[PDB]
Design a protein around this nucleic acid. Sequence first.
DNA 1: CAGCTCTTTGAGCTG
Length: 195
Amino acid sequence: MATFYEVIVRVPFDVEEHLPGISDSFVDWVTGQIWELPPESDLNLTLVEQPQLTVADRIRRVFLYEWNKFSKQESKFFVQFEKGSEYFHLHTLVETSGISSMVLGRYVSQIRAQLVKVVFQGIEPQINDWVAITKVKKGGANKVVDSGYIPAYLLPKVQPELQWAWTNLDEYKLAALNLEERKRLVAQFLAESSQ
DNA sequence: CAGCTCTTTGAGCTG
Ligand SMILES: [Cl-]
Ligand SMILES: [Mg+2]
Ligand SMILES: [Mg+2]
Ligand SMILES: [Mg+2]
């Protein structure tokens, strides 16, 4: 099996509060992209907040683009955008291959700087700890998990908490945007787990 | 149709 690190990015969801003074161009971009559900999806599109998703997807792609240059390969990932009770956030589960825990902090710090530069027009998001690596315990090492984390924690999310998900892991391709498939994989996970 | 372009990163689109 492969192993994964997790980075949680709190995605700006109120431009006036999080990106004070940002140019109108940012607003035009985020409000102008139209999203459509693939036919395999069984999600209710009306529950998806498009401007926030547009930002999350841009963050995701910039993140993975930079990550791959660090890892030197097309790293495996499962990313899920969620609308939490306090924050909209991206759960970025990325394979550890080619990235040591010792250097992970620095690499993530560089990606954060790139996000600020190429996504937020040089404006630092006014959200505390908006880019955080999941640790073993508060004040510990970087947490490493296996794919079992996906059906245990990510898959069971439903709308409106679940906003969208992406993955290059074949086992979870249908699950990304299909509730019925997520339910099937979670049920299988619980069955095996109870034993 | 071979590149140029865009909150890209590669493939749709145009000179
Ligand atoms: Cl939250
Ligand atoms: Mg290379
Ligand atoms: Mg969450
Ligand atoms: Mg493209």
